[PDB]
Amino acid sequence: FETIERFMDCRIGRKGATGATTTIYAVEADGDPNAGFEKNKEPGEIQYLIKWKGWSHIHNTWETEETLKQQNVRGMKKLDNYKKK
Amino acid sequence: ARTKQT
Amino acid sequence: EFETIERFMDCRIGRKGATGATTTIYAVEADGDPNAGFEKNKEPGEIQYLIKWKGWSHIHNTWETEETLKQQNVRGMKKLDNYKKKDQETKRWLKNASPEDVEYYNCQQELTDDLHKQYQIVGRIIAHSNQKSAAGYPDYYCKWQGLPYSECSWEDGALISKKFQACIDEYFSRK
Amino acid sequence: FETIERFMDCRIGRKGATGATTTIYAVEADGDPNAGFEKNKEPGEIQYLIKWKGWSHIHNTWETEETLKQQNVRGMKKLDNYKKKDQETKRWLKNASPEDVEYYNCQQELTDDLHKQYQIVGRIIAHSNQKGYPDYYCKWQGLPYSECSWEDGALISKKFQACIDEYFSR
DSSP: OOBEEEEEEEEEEOTTOOGGGGSHHHHHHHOBTTTTOOTTSSOOEEEEEEEETTSOGGGOEEEOHHHHHHHTOBOHHHHHHHSOO | OOOOOO | OOOBEEEEEEEEEEOTTOOSGGGSHHHHHHHOOTTTTOOTTSSOOEEEEEEEETTSOGGGOEEEOHHHHHHTTOBOTHHHHHHHHHHHHHHHHHSSOOHHHHHHHHHHHHHHHHHHHHTTSEEEEEEEBSSOOSSOOOOEEEEETTSOGGGOEEEOHHHHHHHHHHHHHHHHHTO | OOBEEEEEEEEEOOTTOOSGGGSHHHHHHHOOTTSSOOSSOOOOOEEEEEEETTSOGGGOEEEOHHHHHTTTOBOTHHHHHHHHHHHHHHHHHTTSOHHHHHHHHHHHHHHHHHHHHTTSEEEEEEEOSOOOOOOEEEEETTSOGGGOEEEOTTHHHHHOHHHHHHHOOO
């Protein structure tokens, strides 16, 4: 289940600062886990803000190649195409 | 984080 | 490491040794002014300068002498010379000025003086941290009075709560 | 030569409406290279408004992440900070309650008016002998005397004569 409908954004963030704890409602609820991050802590991953099929934007989450992968969403093609610049 | 709170 | 002068905010004479961490508003509210009650008339203090630091809010400004600076090995020293040259240039051009000129300069400088104090106070908390201290304080993204949001910054949760608990209660209150 | 001191604003703007010809006084004297922009429609360019070390705010210019490099400027480690912070906020924006968005709007309006005084002479307090014109030392509205700067006459006289007329009060 669960489909990338679109890559909205991209960033370097604290490793671990992905999934359910990055919804706006999770952040506003329990804090932002990317909540000081800077290129001098040893997570600095690459995080893609991924809007999901059949969920509206409030549910969008920050994931990662590995995080997508290991959840088995479809839409990966998209990633390929976003991986670009 | 980071204060001067010596 | 190590720290950098961004801006000289002010200039004074005070107690020798009244410099450094002990000289922030938060340190001072918590513990009292090392420059306690300094009459020009305890042995002349030293010329001390109020320093605004690279990557640190105005809440963290410290009073420092030419010597502490040199001692702490900070960067931006060039800026102490300009500040002085410039301070001298002002004085010279104001030795003889109307009382009007002198009047203007004292108001128009009380204005700024007061302005700058506002940078140290939080007008709005806009976000907090998902991680918490051992004491269980989160850190807060702060919007400072008098400055644009490009100047917002993450302040230690305990630090803030000591003085801006209201802003805190209010942020959570808006949910 | 030049080193940036503070990033003041950024805009999407016509391509090439960056630089020397974007100074409050050039605009005033020649026109505005970014004038007509997108009354549709043409190619854009994200442009930053720069305050330069050593110059008064009356000389801020708009610039491009390149023109900057294409000019050797120092301070560009500041650009990465800034960019980061803007996105960081363009983002917060799409989800901020109306309550929060009004506040943002009000403050950024003020802040922005502040930043505009900076470029207007409050009082000229001194003047030179090297001379049409003598140079003038200026107190800028909304800032300390610690930020007085010497400026070209002529230039200053184009917009700020009333201030110089006053100053010759002896």
